[PDB]
Amino acid sequence: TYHVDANDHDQSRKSQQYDLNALHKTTKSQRHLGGSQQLL
């Protein structure tokens, strides 16, 4: 369930193509492994 899009600069590819509807650009907002939506 991990996304790999670090070298994508000309083939323009987004984190496991899910945005707008899914908005998979937030990654739950888990501050590292154990974080939550607190986000201090």
Brief descriptors of the model:
monomer, 40 residues, little secondary structure, elongated, protein fibril, semenogelin 1, HIV enhancer, monomeric
Into which percentage range does the β-strand content fall?
under 5%
What does the main sheet amount to? none
Oligomer: monomer
User: Radius of gyration from the CA trace?
Assistant: 12 Å
- Shape summary: elongated
Number of domains: 1
Approximately how much helix is present in the residues? under 10%
Organism: Homo sapiens (Human)
Protein name: Alpha-inhibin-92
Summarize the structure in words:
- It is a single chain.
- With 40 residues, the chain is largely without helices or strands.
- The chain has one domain.
- It has no helices and no strands.
- The protein is elongated.
- The N and C termini lie far apart (26 Å).
- It is classed as protein fibril.
- The entry lists the keywords semenogelin 1, HIV enhancer.
- The assembly is monomeric.
- The entry is titled "The spatial structure of amyloidogenic SEM1(68-107) peptide".
Fold blueprint:
Blueprint: no helix or strand
Quick overview:
This is Alpha-inhibin-92. By secondary structure, this protein is mostly loops.
